[PDB]
Design a binder for these strands. Sequence first.
RNA 1: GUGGGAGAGGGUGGUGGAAUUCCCGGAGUAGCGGUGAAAUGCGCAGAUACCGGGAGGAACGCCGAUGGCGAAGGCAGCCACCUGGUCCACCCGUGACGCUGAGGCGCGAAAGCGUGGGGAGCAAACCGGAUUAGAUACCCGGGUAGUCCACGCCCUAAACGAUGCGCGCUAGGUCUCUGGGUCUCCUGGGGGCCGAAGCUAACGCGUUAAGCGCGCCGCCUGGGGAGUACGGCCGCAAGGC
Lengths: 88, 73, 101, 119
Amino acid sequence: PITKEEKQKVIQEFARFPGDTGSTEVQVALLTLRINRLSEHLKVHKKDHHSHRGLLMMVGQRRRLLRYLQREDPERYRALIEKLGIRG
Amino acid sequence: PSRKAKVKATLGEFDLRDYRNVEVLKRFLSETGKILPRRRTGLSAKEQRILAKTIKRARILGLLPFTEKLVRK
Amino acid sequence: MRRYEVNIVLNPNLDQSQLALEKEIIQRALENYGARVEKVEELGLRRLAYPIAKDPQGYFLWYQVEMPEDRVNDLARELRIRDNVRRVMVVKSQEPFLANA
Amino acid sequence: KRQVASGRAYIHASYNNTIVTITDPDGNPITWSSGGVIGYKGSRKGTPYAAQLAALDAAKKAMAYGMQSVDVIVRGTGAGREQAIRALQASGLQVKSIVDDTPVPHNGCRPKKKFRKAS
RNA sequence: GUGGGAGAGGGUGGUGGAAUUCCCGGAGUAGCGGUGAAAUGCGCAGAUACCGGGAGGAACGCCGAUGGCGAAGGCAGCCACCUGGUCCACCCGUGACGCUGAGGCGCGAAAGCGUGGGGAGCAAACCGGAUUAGAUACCCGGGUAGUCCACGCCCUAAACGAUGCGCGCUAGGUCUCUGGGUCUCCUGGGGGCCGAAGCUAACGCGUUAAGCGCGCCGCCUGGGGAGUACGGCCGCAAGGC
Ligand SMILES: [K+]
Ligand SMILES: [Mg+2]
Ligand SMILES: [Mg+2]
Ligand SMILES: [Mg+2]
Ligand SMILES: [Mg+2]
Ligand SMILES: [Mg+2]
Ligand SMILES: [Mg+2]
Ligand SMILES: [Mg+2]
Ligand SMILES: [Mg+2]
Ligand SMILES: [Mg+2]
Ligand SMILES: [Mg+2]
Ligand SMILES: [Mg+2]
Ligand SMILES: [Mg+2]
Ligand SMILES: [Mg+2]
Ligand SMILES: [Mg+2]
Ligand SMILES: [Mg+2]
Ligand SMILES: [Mg+2]
Ligand SMILES: [Mg+2]
Ligand SMILES: [Mg+2]
Ligand SMILES: [Mg+2]
Ligand SMILES: [Mg+2]
Ligand SMILES: [Mg+2]
């Protein structure tokens, strides 16, 4: 699954400052974690469609938070995209 | 009938999650192996459906009967 | 790491060397699948509510262990390879839920 | 050549007939009778009178093997299984128990159309 | 974000007992079966009923609900693993990041198609027995595709709450599932029934609107001809849009 220790690592990685949990950066991090997990599980289990929908949803949320970020702070969006390898 | 006396009244404090404990559990099924209706056990929906799952575990363990024969008749 | 209860039921007609051998081999199965053994309750020969391998009784071993999840099923399957073992039921541990208290 | 004297008496009762099979405490049949065994031919076989005659003829042929007491098992529900019980009640056999073994599946097979609205 | 939760939500692997069918063995004898009544059928190569053993497929009694989960189709033995959605409490983080959504892509009961397995019960077609004036039917005895699995197609439906999605507002009572609380009762979140105001042609609907508003999408414009014809697209086909 995803253990709390792991999730913590990614938050305490991606926070803007000590104490930040819900900022855009951290969210797109977590979202991406979860996504990469889910597509690993969907490489096998090609038959599991009901989870796959959930991943479509996850993906869409990711892309939206990104659309926002890039509307505000293009250099920080460059940052995120460099870190998680997304959009390319 | 069937509202006469209810099971959970008689029994004291007990683990509903224990499949290993026969003596508590055997109370909750009928003359046949059948798990008893709510009115007869008098448990909440949650309780009932938990007892189900632990009874079925106990069954697979060979502890409680899957079914019995009806005497009298 | 997670907490499971391993339910093993053996044949009641075993002599002592045979019993100690089986438990030796179940021990080895646990050791070699990476499971730490927290507790054991051995109840023993007890009347089944229906025949198992056309046997009116059954021999009851209970373990409480903690092992890596990815291996669980393998371990369980290992325990069934043995001839003298009749049921093996392996359940994840969950704290009591007690009605009427 | 038996000398059985205590046994099992099975009543298999459907909508179309009855069969009493009387056997030994191991379960091997000592004798059996039925609706058609007694004279009856058509539908009249699922008639409680016929069920009486059958269970009775059975108990007769049974005391011929020198049987005294028996334990009844009843499979099936349908006209006059009870009348077969009543035949055996006093047929001249002391009946120790009565049971109901009528099988039911946990839904294995798909019943014929006649029997549908189930599985 | 953190802390709890319920659940037949999905996928993979494993195991359980009941039941049917067949086979092997013991005992036993003249029928069993089936209907309104019968006949075909099976049975002295020993059935039916009965006890013991084996094999194999399929489905999960009780619990089971007026219950629950899911976007829908749909989901029910038990266990573990992988995994989706959702609800509550705290009021901690970000700071309008929101809604809808023509195209597109994906899912999509059943039947059906392809290749390879599997095949117990049931069962179109078929073969028979009855019934009837006839009976291509209803009833009875058989039985193939099929129903099951893997992969790939097909894309329909009374795919129904015949009720598009989202947010705000407008009496209550009652029953219920699942959280939290100062646990009678209050308070979130689902499922039902009765009903204020209102709406409605009526029936009905009525904080789970069919009320009062706003945003956006789909769609309608007399019946038959007709979901036909022509054309295009998709499909191996059947056929679909
Ligand atoms: K429609
Ligand atoms: Mg008849
Ligand atoms: Mg489920
Ligand atoms: Mg003949
Ligand atoms: Mg002969
Ligand atoms: Mg076969
Ligand atoms: Mg029911
Ligand atoms: Mg439905
Ligand atoms: Mg979950
Ligand atoms: Mg705050
Ligand atoms: Mg601020
Ligand atoms: Mg389809
Ligand atoms: Mg199909
Ligand atoms: Mg096919
Ligand atoms: Mg037919
Ligand atoms: Mg409907
Ligand atoms: Mg209400
Ligand atoms: Mg409510
Ligand atoms: Mg009014
Ligand atoms: Mg109303
Ligand atoms: Mg016109
Ligand atoms: Mg059409």
